[PDB]
Amino acid sequence: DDTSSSINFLTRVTGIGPSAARKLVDEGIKTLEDLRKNEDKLNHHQRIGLKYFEDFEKRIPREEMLQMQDIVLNEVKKLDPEYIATVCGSFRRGAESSGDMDVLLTHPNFTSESSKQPKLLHRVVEQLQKVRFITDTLSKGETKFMGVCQLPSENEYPHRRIDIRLIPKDQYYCGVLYFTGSDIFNKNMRAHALEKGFTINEYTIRPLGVTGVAGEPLPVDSEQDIFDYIQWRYREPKDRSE
């Protein structure tokens, strides 16, 4: 009813899940001003999302993403030029507007065999915070950073959502591929790969076998490599619609 109407709204809050949304309804929290008078019931994450409820409702236009991309690329470079960073999302696909920033970061020092170098990711976060690009943190893991940022006003921009994932280097391209989408494209390409005797997911590509239940990840040093394995012309992200 007009109340279910309420779980619907809260859920619009980054942090607010259903179960998470449900309880706050059992507490008599429905609208948003409800929420604001009730920060204490909210975790840190839900908290921030509430704080940027609005901004978060707005689309990011190419021009901005672009400048965002530069700040991120450039800062990472001064830390260590051995770091690779790539902005995925429809945006890499040529998209005219985006909803958030998805950054994929990797380093030769970190492979799926290591598995333990939080410093790698943290250091960058730290640097962006220092430059004042990153403005808040929703959560921050060993391998994943979800937060807020904003373009440097000179006078203001809405704050935007940003995510940074640390991926091992030997799993990187697969990841950029995957995170680049689109979804159909991923679907169509995994389907083809299968016809080709190969299974692809967001980490690796692996040959199949009898009975099917098979594997052993092939070395991938670029996106192209993936296409090669399955012998398909190389599609630049823009032609990745389907």
From Swiss-Prot:
Changing M101T: 50% loss of activity. Keywords: Acetylation, Cytoplasm, DNA damage, DNA repair, DNA replication, DNA synthesis, DNA-binding, DNA-directed DNA polymerase, Isopeptide bond, Lyase, Magnesium, Metal-binding, Methylation, Nucleotidyltransferase, Nucleus, Potassium, Sodium, Transferase, Ubl conjugation. It is found in: Nucleus; Cytoplasm. Na(+) 2 binds at T11, V13, I16. Its EC number is 2.7.7.7, 4.2.99.-, 4.2.99.18. Its cofactor is Mg(2+). Changing M101I: No loss of activity. Its main location: nucleus. The modification Omega-N-methylarginine is found at R62. Signal peptide: none annotated. Methylation by PRMT6 stimulates the polymerase activity by enhancing DNA binding and processivity. GO terms for biological process: apoptotic process; base-excision repair; base-excision repair, gap-filling; DNA damage response; DNA replication; double-strand break repair via nonhomologous end joining; homeostasis of number of cells; immunoglobulin heavy chain V-D-J recombination. Mg(2+) 1 binds at D100, D102. Coiled coil: none annotated. Binds 2 magnesium ions per subunit. It catalyses: DNA(n) + a 2'-deoxyribonucleoside 5'-triphosphate = DNA(n+1) + diphosphate; a 5'-end 2'-deoxyribose-2'-deoxyribonucleotide-DNA = (2E,4S)-4-hydroxypenten-2-al-5-phosphate + a 5'-end 5'-phospho-2'-deoxyribonucleoside-DNA + H(+); 2'-deoxyribonucleotide-(2'-deoxyribose 5'-phosphate)-2'-deoxyribonucleotide-DNA = a 3'-end 2'-deoxyribonucleotide-(2,3-dehydro-2,3-deoxyribose 5'-phosphate)-DNA + a 5'-end 5'-phospho-2'-deoxyribonucleoside-DNA + H(+). GO terms for molecular function: 5'-deoxyribose-5-phosphate lyase activity; class I DNA-(apurinic or apyrimidinic site) endonuclease activity; damaged DNA binding; DNA binding; DNA-directed DNA polymerase activity; enzyme binding; lyase activity; metal ion binding. Belongs to the DNA polymerase type-X family. Residues 239-252 form a flexible loop which appears to affect the polymerase fidelity. Monomer. Binds single-stranded DNA (ssDNA). Interacts with APEX1, LIG1, LIG3, FEN1, PCNA and XRCC1. Interacts with HUWE1/ARF-BP1, STUB1/CHIP and USP47. Interacts with FAM168A. Repair polymerase that plays a key role in base-excision repair. During this process, the damaged base is excised by specific DNA glycosylases, the DNA backbone is nicked at the abasic site by an apurinic/apyrimidic (AP) endonuclease, and POLB removes 5'-deoxyribose-phosphate from the preincised AP site acting as a 5'-deoxyribose-phosphate lyase (5'-dRP lyase); through its DNA polymerase activity, it adds one nucleotide to the 3' end of the arising single-nucleotide gap. This is DNA polymerase beta. It comes from Rattus norvegicus (Rat).
